[PDB]
């Protein structure tokens, strides 16, 4: 049995940690909703 618990307000934070790159990837999406990398 699944249940939900509140974890926060949805707001933009000015002091957030900033990280991660911005890759451009060719991908395929199958009928089961799975993405896979295409090359």
């Amino acid at each position: 049995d699944m249940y939900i618990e509140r974890a926060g307000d949805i707001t933009w934070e000015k002091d957030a940690e900033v990280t991660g790159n911005s890759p451009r990837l060719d991908v395929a999406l199958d009928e089961s909703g799975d993405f896979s990398l295409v090359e």
Binding site: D9, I10, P23
Partner: protein, 156 residues
Amino acid sequence: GETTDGVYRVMTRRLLGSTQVGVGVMQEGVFHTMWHVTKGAALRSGEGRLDPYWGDVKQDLVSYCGPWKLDAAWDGLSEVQLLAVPPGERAKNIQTLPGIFKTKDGDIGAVALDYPAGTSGSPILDKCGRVIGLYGNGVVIKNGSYVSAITQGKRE
């Protein structure tokens, strides 16, 4: 139950202890999560019950109590924030510039951030605090890093 707008954890008691299987967004009385988090099952909020209303496995989305309400979209230029809600950990904002998933049916934004599976459903936000999609459906790249699509539904 609890119907206030916000981000919520999705938990189960079927595995060891209480396990966080994902996250979702309550907005306008509707709960929004990824299909793979709940597999379309009913949910509890305290003494109340949320029943599925709309869902689609290919989009990997599901709404409860009403139709999908989130309609904002990534502008394709600006940085966004993942409002990550990891298992057993405080909600934390992470700012990043999305990449792109290029598909035969068009381009979608993608966020390259390494969080555990139970973070799936966490919202991605624009500078006005609007939810532009949910994090948690994507691909694992060469070293084991994770890249999620910015998955958004359609508001009718």
